[PDB]
Amino acid sequence: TVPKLYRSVIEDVINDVRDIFLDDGVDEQVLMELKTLWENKLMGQVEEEPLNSEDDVSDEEGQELFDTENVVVCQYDKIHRSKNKWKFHLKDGIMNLNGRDYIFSKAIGDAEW
Amino acid sequence: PVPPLSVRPAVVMQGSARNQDDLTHKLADIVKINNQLRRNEQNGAAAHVIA
Amino acid sequence: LDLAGPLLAFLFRGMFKNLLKEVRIYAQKFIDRGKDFNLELAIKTRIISDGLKYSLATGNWGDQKKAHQARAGVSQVLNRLTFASTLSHLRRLNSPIGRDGKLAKPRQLHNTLWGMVCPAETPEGHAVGLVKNLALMAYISVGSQPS
Amino acid sequence: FGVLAKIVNYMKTRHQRGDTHPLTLDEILDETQHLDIGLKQKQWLMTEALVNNPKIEVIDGKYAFKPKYNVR
Amino acid sequence: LSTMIGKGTGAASFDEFGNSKYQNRRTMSSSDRAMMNAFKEITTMADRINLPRNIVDRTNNLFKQVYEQKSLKGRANDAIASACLYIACRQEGVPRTFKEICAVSRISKKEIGRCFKLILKALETSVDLITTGDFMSRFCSNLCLPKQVQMAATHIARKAVELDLVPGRSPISVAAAAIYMASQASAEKRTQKEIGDIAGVADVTIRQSYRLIYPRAPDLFPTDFKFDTPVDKLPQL
Amino acid sequence: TNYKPVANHQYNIEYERKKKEDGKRARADKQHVLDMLFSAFEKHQYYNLKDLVDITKQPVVYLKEILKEIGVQNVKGIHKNTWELKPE
Amino acid sequence: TPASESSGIVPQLQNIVSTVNLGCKLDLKTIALRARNAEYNPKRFAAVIMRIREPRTTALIFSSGKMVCTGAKSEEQSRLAARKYARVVQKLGFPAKFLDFKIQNMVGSCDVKFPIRLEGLVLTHQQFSSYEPELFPGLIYRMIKPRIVLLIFVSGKVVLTGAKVRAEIYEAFENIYPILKGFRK
Amino acid sequence: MAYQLYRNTTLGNSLQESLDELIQSQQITPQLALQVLLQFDKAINAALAQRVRNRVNFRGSLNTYRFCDNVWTFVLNDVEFREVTELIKVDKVKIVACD
Amino acid sequence: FIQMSVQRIVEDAPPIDLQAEAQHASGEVEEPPRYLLKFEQIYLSKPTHWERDGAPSPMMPNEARLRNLTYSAPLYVDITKTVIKEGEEQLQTQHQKTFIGKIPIMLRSTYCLLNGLTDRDLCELNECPLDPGGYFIINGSEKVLIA
């Protein structure tokens, strides 16, 4: 059902940029090669600075730069919070988890930190 | 010349001072604009507005 | 003869149209500020409520600021000295006129008043023949659409 | 025009800075960050803004001193 | 300040060329023109709920006092007029709810309430505390309820406060719940939505308040009341 | 009548409109704002202050300090004012 | 008053309000970009919002270099959180400095464990008390001594705010408690 | 204007790389590739708007967050995506949201 | 005058429309917001009085004279809002039943409650059976309009 959606996307994109290819005078073979390659790819001190008396209150830089975990790109409708309790109302939505790819139009949501 | 108060004893009619002789009220209008035209001469006197 | 209906009708039209303007000004002020509208708040009830209250009480008529030169004295306190003064008062009618010195023919008793206005029954005073009283059987049309 | 005003403003600041040393158009484009204004506008500049300019000072083959001319 | 003037002799009265006979009239008191404009708003508000002139006269008076001190000049002038109207109404011993004065105005309930406290601070003055009795009359009246039922509701309200059955409730809501109990104990039976509609409170608030007073309903009615439906048959909702 | 709004129903809607990111302006992005001024001035020689306020979504007094910096002002009739970066 | 020391139920601190100046100008955007567990909406408000779970607190920092810290259970813990944030800013490389730290408010609360009649309290203290059961369900008491505001409820719950020193809360509460006991149900 | 963000995706990245090959072979231009990427954005937004109608529900531990330029950036830990007919758990996920 | 004249006047010619002055200096899109107002059937209650409490009650012409009231009745009108915006919305219509002012009733006319009661009832209300009516009551004073 969803690979078909990507196929839908392939048809829409190829169709709509075809005219761009023609406008440049680029060959339709290049368009097909693009599609085929793309498909193959698809699968004092204490009054100044007692500040050093709190050294190491730090955490892992591990969780952002590496991106070892999975990623989700979507949109938000409204975000709401109550102390350490957070609520999310999201919309639109492409997910990638442990390998497979999923999709949503709306997603609602609660998390604590 | 400003006529003396005996000519404009207002009329009070209850209240107190509610009885400012309407001629006085007109006299108050004359003084007000004449004060303004005076201040106009003191200040940025125009031309047509003075007229 | 203009009676209570057509006399009131002149005033109600003017205040109600005037009321329409005050509601027009309110809706524009709503639209200017960034919108906050309440149709029930725009009606300035006092225009009508108090306006009819005022004209009918003083006896004046209409705009007061200017309109009051001829159509003055049209409402009156109902005289109640006997039973007859009242019946006669309610059944009174007034011709408007100049004032203070006029001598002509709208003071004598035209033949066409026969069966219509009282032969003899008019103020013994300065306004002789100008304020008249309606005969005993006489009647008045309310009027309707000719369609 | 707006771009030209930024040239005027830059030149104004430079005069204010104390200097009236002439520069090439290219340098002025660069310093005003308007290098990619295109050939057309540059051409308009060359054949109006720089030559039809009523108080432009040409010196050392380059264009200087735009803000002022009345007093020296 | 001064008198006025206005058009009318037919003319000569120059405009010589333009179309303006003689001259235009002139404004006089501008610093205060929005005080006069406040007096205009107070009367409009006042008539829209049929208030007496005596209230309007107190309201106008309070306002002038607040204006002269200039202690709260920053606030919305219309909010100040509305709060003055609320105070005047409570001082004359016939309070209107904050919900009611808000209705005839464009100012928010929160802002009228806030201004209310500030004016109280500005004039260093205090008012009486509202009771059930001060509102039981108006509500029962607008619902075309019989005089006898109004009387019973009053007694129901008064006793309810006396037995301290509602320590965690507002007197208006309790008033509303008494009205409902009375009405359902008579032939009239006004619906919760209707009572809600006159009182302005949420009909869930009445239902909760009713559920709280229901266990003692027998003890609250007047012994001289002419019952229609007995309490042993009084509905639950 | 007066079926109690306690928070006027239109007024609620207007606050709701406000309840979508309002009351904060760029001022702050100066240079990018200058870009908008330069772009606008390319369309016409003079503009009303009100059109610039709509166009650049910033505090008026700050924009005035900019118009003092790179321009002049030109008024006509009943306080009808238009500003211009002195074209030449 | 020894005689009533069961007044001495010592009201619990729940919130502390302090401010501090970092002594340097900063760029919130870069900060919001760089910092973790932080939020910044310049289209809604000016300050950047940061939140730690340590002594469970939150701080709001401006661009002038001033910031406000809240959420502390105590003033020491508040100086700790304030110092923790300034440390984080130090860790950003910015010229962070512990300057002008000061408490602005303290909040306390407690329960007296008995019901009372607000109608009496508002009657007898009419000059200071203000009660609007139609609007707010509590009662607002404005003392003129330790200029403190109190919130009184029928349950017997009390909250106190406007405080500059914990002693002032105890003093406000020791003073008013007998009156409240004098209006018990 | 449609958000560039979806270019970050594997789908988006495979496209950018496919275009890059075409540029390596100099069969197209960088501007034209950008124009294709812009069209791909519009078209995939349209595909989202017209075809995609499903929804999902989730609960989890929040690890870090960010908000700047009207862009929300999260990283959640021990997340659980729940659907009416499936369920998807993962140890950690980043959520970027624009509007 | 009530049964005809006031209805005809509110129907006659007062539709008002207002079109906001939006999309200035910048505009396109589709909407300079536009509103129209229309007035339908008029309603007139029986003579009423509002006590300071806020409670309305029926007013008795005798009471009106002693307490110095204005014996008048409330007038209500049907008002409509129609929002035929410049495109998207066109079927946004809402009905209202609104108080506009107080019309003075004239005594014992078809709209003044005394017309319906019988002779024994009227004597019960302390009103004279022979009293003719046809005069307004204003601020305590009985006022008659002269033809």
Counting other chains too, the contacts that H33-36 makes at CB distance below 8 Å and 24 or more residues apart are H35/A17, H35/A20, H36/A13, H36/A17, H36/A20
Taking the alpha carbons of E132, E134, E137, E140 in that order, is the dihedral positive or negative? Answer: negative
Structural domain boundaries enclosing F57? 22-84
Which residue in the block uniquely carries the two structure tokens 């602005």? Answer: G104
**Resolution of this entry in Å?**
3.9
Domain presence at residue F6: no
Size of interface E-G (CB pairs under 8 A): 27
Number of domains in chain G: 2
Decide if F88 and D53 are in contact by the 8 Å CB cutoff: yes
**How far is Cα of residue G47 from the mean position of the Cα atoms in its chain?**
20
CA nearest to G131, candidates G119, G115, G143: G119
Decide if I98 and F54 are in contact by the 8 Å CB cutoff: no
**Residues of chain G contacting H, Cβ within 8 Å:** 29, 32-33, 35-41, 43
Decide if I25 and F55 are in contact by the 8 Å CB cutoff: yes
Taking the alpha carbons of C107, C113, C117, C118 in that order, is the dihedral positive or negative? Answer: positive
Please, which residues have CB within 8 angstroms of residue B37's CB and are 6 or more apart in sequence? B50
CA nearest to E225, candidates E154, E140, E177: E154
The partner residue sitting opposite A64, judged by closest CB among H58, H62, H75, is H75
The three-class DSSP label of residue I33 is coil
Q: Containing H/E element for A81?
A: strand A70-82
**Distances in Å between the alpha carbon of B25 and those of A52, B10, C64?**
79, 10, 22
Domain stops at, among G103, G118, G150: G103
CB I74 within 8 A of CB I44: yes
G27 and G96, same domain (yes or no): yes
- What count of residues does chain C have? 147
What residues 13-72 of chain A have any CB closer than 8 A to a CB of chain G? Answer: 47-55, 57-59, 64
Distance, in Å, from the CA atom of I138 to the CA atom of I69, rounded to the nearest integer, reads 7
CA nearest to G183, candidates G93, G116, G89, G115: G116
E29-126 is classed CATH 3.40.50.300? no
Distance, in Å, from the CA atom of E44 to the CA atom of E81, rounded to the nearest integer, reads 11
**Distances in Å between the alpha carbon of E30 and those of C22, C35, E26, I104, I145?**
22, 27, 11, 37, 41
Identity of residue E205 = T
Q: Chain E closest CA to I9's CA: distance in Å?
A: 24
Per CATH, the number for E127-234 is 1.10.472.10
Structural domain boundaries enclosing G10? 6-17+104-185
- Cβ-count burial of C139 within 10 angstroms (0-12 exposed, 13-18 middle, 19+ buried)? exposed
The three-class DSSP label of residue A80 is strand
Please, which residues have CB within 8 angstroms of residue E151's CB and are 6 or more apart in sequence? E222
The partner residue sitting opposite E98, judged by closest CB among G115, G130, G134, is G134
**CA E219, E225, E231: angle at the middle one, nearest 5?**
50
Residues on chain A touching H47 (C-beta within 8 angstroms): 5, 8-9, 12
Q: What is the CATH number of the domain that holds F72?
A: 1.10.10.10
- CATH class as words, domain H1-53: mainly alpha
Locate the chain H residue with the closest alpha carbon to G30. Answer: H68
Chains E and H touch (3+ CB pairs under 8 A): no
Could you give the residue ranges of the DSSP H alpha helices within C39-143? 39-42, 46-58, 83-90
**Distances in Å between the alpha carbon of G77 and those of A44, A55, G11, G17, I112?**
22, 16, 18, 12, 78
| G66 carries a ligand binding annotation | yes
The three-class DSSP label of residue D9 is helix
Domain ranges of chain H: 1-53, 54-99
Counting other chains too, the contacts that G7-11 makes at CB distance below 8 Å and 24 or more residues apart are G7/G173, G7/G174, G7/G177, G7/G178, G8/G174, G9/G110, G9/G112, G10/G110, G10/G170, G11/G108, G11/G109, G11/G110, G11/G158, G11/G160, G11/G169, G11/G170, G11/G173
What residues 4-43 of chain G have any CB closer than 8 A to a CB of chain F? Answer: 41-43
CB H82 within 8 A of CB H57: yes
Structural domain boundaries enclosing A5? 1-43
G45 and G78, same domain (yes or no): yes
Identity of residue C88 = S
Which residue in the block uniquely carries the two structure tokens 């409490």? Answer: I53
Q: Chain C closest CA to I74's CA: distance in Å?
A: 9
Could you give the residue ranges of the DSSP H alpha helices within F44-86? 49-56, 60-70
Determination technique for this entry: cryo-EM
Size of interface F-I (CB pairs under 8 A): 13
Sheet holding I93-104, edge to edge: I16-19, I34-44, I72-82, I93-104
Which residue in the block uniquely carries the two structure tokens 């005394």? Answer: I114
- Taking each helix axis from N to C end, the angle separating E53-69 and E77-91, rounded to the nearest 10 degrees, works out to 130
Please, which residues have CB within 8 angstroms of residue F12's CB and are 6 or more apart in sequence? F5
Beta strand extents in chain D (DSSP E only): 57-59, 62-64
Residues on chain B touching E1 (C-beta within 8 angstroms): 28-29, 32
G51 and G62, same domain (yes or no): yes
Which of E39, E44, E49, E78 should we substitute to test contact with C (largest number of C Cβ atoms within 10 Å)?
A: E44
Distance, in Å, from the CA atom of G83 to the CA atom of G99, rounded to the nearest integer, reads 10
Q: What residue spans in chain E does CATH classification 1.10.472.10 cover?
A: 29-126, 127-234
Locate the chain I residue with the closest alpha carbon to E51. Answer: I52
Q: Containing H/E element for H21?
A: helix H10-24
G11 and G46, same domain (yes or no): no
**CA G45, G50, G54: angle at the middle one, nearest 5?**
155
Question: Tokens in use for E43?
Answer: 């009367």
Cβ neighbours around E113 below 10 Å, total: 19
Taking the alpha carbons of G169, G171, G177, G179 in that order, is the dihedral positive or negative? Answer: negative
Q: Chain D closest CA to F42's CA: distance in Å?
A: 6
Decide if I52 and E51 are in contact by the 8 Å CB cutoff: yes
Which residue in the block uniquely carries the two structure tokens 């200087």? Answer: D64
| A89 carries a ligand binding annotation | no
Distance, in Å, from the CA atom of E173 to the CA atom of E180, rounded to the nearest integer, reads 11
Domain stops at, among G103, G122, G149: G103
Question: Tokens in use for A64?
Answer: 């952002």
Give the DSSP letter string of E39-74: HHHHHHHHHHTT--HHHHHHHHHHHHHHHHHTTTTT
Counting other chains too, the contacts that C138-147 makes at CB distance below 8 Å and 24 or more residues apart are C140/C1, C140/C3, C140/I147, C142/C5
All partners of chain C with 3 or more CB pairs under 8 angstroms: E, F, I
- Cβ-count burial of G115 within 10 angstroms (0-12 exposed, 13-18 middle, 19+ buried)? middle
The partner residue sitting opposite E106, judged by closest CB among C41, C44, C46, is C41
Distance, in Å, from the CA atom of E163 to the CA atom of E207, rounded to the nearest integer, reads 20
Distance, in Å, from the CA atom of E215 to the CA atom of E210, rounded to the nearest integer, reads 9
Please, which residues have CB within 8 angstroms of residue A15's CB and are 6 or more apart in sequence? none
Decide if F7 and E109 are in contact by the 8 Å CB cutoff: yes
H54-99 is classed CATH 2.60.40.10? no
**Is E4 part of the contact surface with chain B (CB cutoff 8 Å)?**
no
Beta strand extents in chain E (DSSP E only): none
G160 and G150, same domain (yes or no): yes
**CA E43, E46, E51: angle at the middle one, nearest 5?**
125
Give the DSSP letter string of F10-45: HHHHHHHHHTTT-S---SS-HHHHHHHHHHHHHH-S
Largest CA distance in chain G: 61
